[PDB]
Curated annotation (Swiss-Prot), chain A:
Disulfide bonds: none
Location of this chain's protein in the cell: Plastid, Chloroplast thylakoid membrane
Record's function text: Produces ATP from ADP in the presence of a proton gradient across the membrane. The alpha chain is a regulatory subunit.
Protein name: ATP synthase subunit alpha, chloroplastic
Superkingdom to which the source organism belongs: Eukaryota
Family under the similarity heading: Belongs to the ATPase alpha/beta chains family.
Organism: Spinacia oleracea
Subunit structure: F-type ATPases have 2 components, CF(1) - the catalytic core - and CF(0) - the membrane proton channel. CF(1) has five subunits: alpha(3), beta(3), gamma(1), delta(1), epsilon(1). CF(0) has four main subunits: a, b, b' and c.
UniProtKB/Swiss-Prot annotation, chain B:
Subunit and interaction comment: F-type ATPases have 2 components, CF(1) - the catalytic core - and CF(0) - the membrane proton channel. CF(1) has five subunits: alpha(3), beta(3), gamma(1), delta(1), epsilon(1). CF(0) has four main subunits: a, b, b' and c.
Keyword Transit peptide on entry: yes
Catalytic site positions: C90
Protein name per the record: ATP synthase gamma chain, chloroplastic
Membrane topology: Peripheral membrane protein
A Gene Ontology term for the protein's cellular component: proton-transporting ATP synthase complex
One Pfam family in the UniProt entry: ATP-synt
Keywords: ATP synthesis, CF(1), Chloroplast, Disulfide bond, Hydrogen ion transport, Ion transport, Membrane, Plastid, Thylakoid, Transit peptide, Transport
GO molecular function, one term: proton-transporting ATP synthase activity, rotational mechanism
Main subcellular location: plastid
UniProtKB/Swiss-Prot annotation, chain C:
GO cellular component terms given for this protein: chloroplast thylakoid membrane; mitochondrion; proton-transporting ATP synthase complex
Record's function text: Produces ATP from ADP in the presence of a proton gradient across the membrane. The catalytic sites are hosted primarily by the beta subunits.
Subunit annotation: F-type ATPases have 2 components, CF(1) - the catalytic core - and CF(0) - the membrane proton channel. CF(1) has five subunits: alpha(3), beta(3), gamma(1), delta(1), epsilon(1). CF(0) has four main subunits: a(1), b(1), b'(1) and c(9-12).
UniProt-recorded Gene Ontology molecular function terms: ATP binding; ATP hydrolysis activity; proton-transporting ATP synthase activity, rotational mechanism
Source taxon at top rank: Eukaryota
Coverage span on the entire protein: 250 to 494 of 498
Protein name as annotated: ATP synthase subunit beta, chloroplastic
Record's subcellular location: Plastid, Chloroplast thylakoid membrane
Family: Belongs to the ATPase alpha/beta chains family.
Primary location: plastid
Keywords: ATP synthesis, ATP-binding, CF(1), Chloroplast, Hydrogen ion transport, Ion transport, Membrane, Nucleotide-binding, Plastid, Thylakoid, Translocase, Transport
Gene Ontology biological process terms in this record: proton motive force-driven mitochondrial ATP synthesis
Amino acid sequence: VSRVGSAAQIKAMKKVAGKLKLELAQFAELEAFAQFASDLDKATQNQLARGQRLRELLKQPQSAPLTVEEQV
Amino acid sequence: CANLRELRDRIGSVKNTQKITEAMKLVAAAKVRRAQEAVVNGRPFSETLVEVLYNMNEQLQTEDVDVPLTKIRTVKKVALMVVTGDRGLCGGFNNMLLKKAESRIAELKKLGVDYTIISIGKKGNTYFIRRPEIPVDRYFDGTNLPTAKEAQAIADDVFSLFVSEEVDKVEMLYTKFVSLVKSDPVIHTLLPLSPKGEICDINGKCVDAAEDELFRLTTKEGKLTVERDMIKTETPAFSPILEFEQDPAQILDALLPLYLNSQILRALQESLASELAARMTAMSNATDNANELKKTLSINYNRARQAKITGEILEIVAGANAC
Amino acid sequence: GLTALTMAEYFRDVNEQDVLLFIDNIFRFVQAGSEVSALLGRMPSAVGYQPTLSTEMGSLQERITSTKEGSITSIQAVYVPADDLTDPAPATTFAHLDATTVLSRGLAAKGIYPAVDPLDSTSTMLQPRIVGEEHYEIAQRVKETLQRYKELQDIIAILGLDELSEEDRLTVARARKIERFLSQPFFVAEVFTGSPGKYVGLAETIRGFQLILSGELDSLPEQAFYLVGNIDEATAKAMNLEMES
Amino acid sequence: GLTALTMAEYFRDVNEQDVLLFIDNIFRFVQAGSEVSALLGRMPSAVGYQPTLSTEMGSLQERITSTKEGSITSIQAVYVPADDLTDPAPATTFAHLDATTVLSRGLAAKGIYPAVDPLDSTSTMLQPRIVGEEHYEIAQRVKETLQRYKELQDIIAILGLDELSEEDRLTVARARKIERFLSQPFFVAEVFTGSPGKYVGLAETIRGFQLILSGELDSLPEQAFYLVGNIDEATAKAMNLEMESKL
Amino acid sequence: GLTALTMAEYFRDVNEQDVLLFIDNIFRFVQAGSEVSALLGRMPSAVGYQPTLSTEMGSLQERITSTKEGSITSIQAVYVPADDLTDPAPATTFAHLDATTVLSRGLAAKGIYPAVDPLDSTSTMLQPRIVGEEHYEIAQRVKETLQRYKELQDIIAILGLDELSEEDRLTVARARKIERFLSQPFFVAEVFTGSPGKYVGLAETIRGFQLILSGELDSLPEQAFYLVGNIDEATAKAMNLEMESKL
């Protein structure tokens, strides 16, 4: 966590980064917990696939930084 | 040392627990495989049976004045029965099965049927005998293997229960084996038997006969899982002549109890496989969880050992000088 | 710490106001004592601190007393070092303090803010004559629920949740609902994350806890109460949750 | 401790009679040594006792030996501090002590008095040529059964009592009956139990343990073995208990 | 330790050659440092190793660096005490170590010499920009295959190779071929068995492991891969077994 919070981010990135953090919260729950049996809510069809795509998007190549607009 | 020693005890006990639940996982896997092998052994008989039943219903166009096992003319007194597994910790098996049981007996008391209930697992009958509000009697048990004599005892009791028209519409709650993680307990009608052979469900996925399900355990990328085989047994319709030594009615009256017994033994075999796989996935979850617990407890024990020894050395060195 | 105390003491003892002083990290006072009295020549003590870790901090705590003129509602964010309460510098703090709340790191690791541990946080004011019988009985019931949860934590360890019988499963679900509901989007944590702050009064939270502990809100999933204020707003959050699907 | 030792040493040098000395809380004879040694300038040893723990403890506990004019049997009641079995003050006494009887708080937790550990309470006199072959074999079977119970404690604790083996379930029931039956109603502890004290020799309890662990009387209720003087008393207690159960 | 360091440092800085430096257990060096510091009387640090632990063992292990004359690459045994990488001495060592390869007792008892565990052995130099993209890819795929094999070693005990899916039965077979291909006959094992021994550079093992894991050699017998060097010699062993298969 960052105690300076979303005050330090850009006015551009703040909305989309808040949405992304909430997306990762949802995915972290749905992966760390149940829905291995198909389910009532039946993930991989609502949030699990997109959360896996997001988390495997978060990985950078070794020492290849992304610019501001690129990462936005 | 009563602080580190307690944590050494917990480390040893959790390691022994992980070993024991790993042994139980492998034992339950071997048991599931041997039950699957018993089903594969029993499949030729059931194949030839769902071919012969089609043969008989092809000769006679369901023209029959016989077969007490097809008295379908009312819904008076259903006899729901549950095949349950007899083990401890049983994954999440017993609660699921008797939950479906309680839902369906409530829905039956809606209709005013005076449902009598047959229990098949000792875990089941132990749950059932505590509460007599549900009308329950005649509980039996076959464990670790559905033996032909025990399935025949079940067949005898349910057939003698149907020979009186006191009991009709005998549907059963056998837990079919869909998936390794969780296997939902389905409810199928048994005894009216639908003399075309097709054993049908709770009205919405009801099965045509000779379209059989034979579950096969193969490993995926890497894990254990079950994959179904929806093999359709081809039927040579009739022998070139097909003489009868009996009448067309007596042959069906002597054949449909045989298919009833076959279906009862299948609903014990697949129930036993599903129970042992629930226990096996409980053992796998428990072993991996105890592995996580052993790692975290070892980390706590290591920082506790360092803290203890460092505090000891600070005591000793600081008390050495005493300037 | 002493100069904060004297500043508040002049406004309590003389001008007679209900002074509040929020001495932040009073552990740092004891650690500064450790520094100086390691360098002052005085002999070392328990694990590292000064020998007078129960008389210098005694002098700090004992001057904060509600005298007959005014009262000093002091808050002291004492800081356990290395996350173990058995440390002497907050151990001597436990004896002096009377509304102790322990912010365990477990609940903040799980995401439930504030991370006030519900078992360990106690008070001298949790008394029948002080708070009324209803508040007392509800506090006792929620403490019982969370304690039974923490006592069968050793069983929702290695085995699974489904090993429990029906009553254990229900009290676990109730404990999860309660432990979630004990979170609140603060009015000052708006900078980090979360919704704008919801001020919750005692007369509103006591009703929500009556509701949850009466089992009447079983239809709701756990994520309904997580980071919500009042329980009517919690039910509205669950309704919108099912609408959004 | 040395005053008591001098009285015993006189009764073993002059009167030539086998004097039985009792020392209790011999751990205090090391704690006082610690409290004076810290002051005496002698540096501190491990966890906080004196440096001369071994020499002082031996200087006491070596004078107690049968010395060809008599036999000083002594029973020291060591105080294992806070159940620190590894603490030096009992750890050096375990070297000097013949028939150690490690009483355990975990076994007084469930009320089994005396809370002597059946496992750890061991003696240099449990050799067969010294004790009797029947005595040795029954002690071996009892101690092995209790070791089996301790190793199955974790399986019992988590995975359900029934899910272990069925013969091992027989062993668990036998171990439960044993670890209750080895409880004695003392005469001096009649005030804490409320039951009158019962004295039992070695032969009666030997014959009791035989039939208890042999599976022959494995049908009695468990509380009929707990706080019972003898095996016939246990059989009568089972009658009383089963009668007051229905009545 | 420092004597070995300078006796190898003169080698590198006079002859410009890749010098090796085998230290026996660094924890034994750190233990000696602890003894010498406790003897000097300087106040002991955490668990009991010396205060100047990091600086001392850094002076030992920082002179091991590839200077522009020639590398002095070393190999250091490490004996963790009570098997925890947390305590300072293995911690301040693993802060230095650049490649850690554990020798496995089960592998030794099987006879897969060298007994280096293929799965748990890790190196910070495995990364692609260091080794080569092909080396990193084939190494990651070999480690994932051996992980698949350690997973399915639980289940081929119960199901058997033909019962489970033929999709990863090829994975089990290729993992057998990999675990056998890893065993190299050394230039020293000749004195024990007379096997002549093969030296394998990186290029040969890279191409051979790509040929094994890609799947060209799906029909070669497993024991044709055991105790062999390059991939061409492995195919020579296989065709040798084929030529003797007639008799």
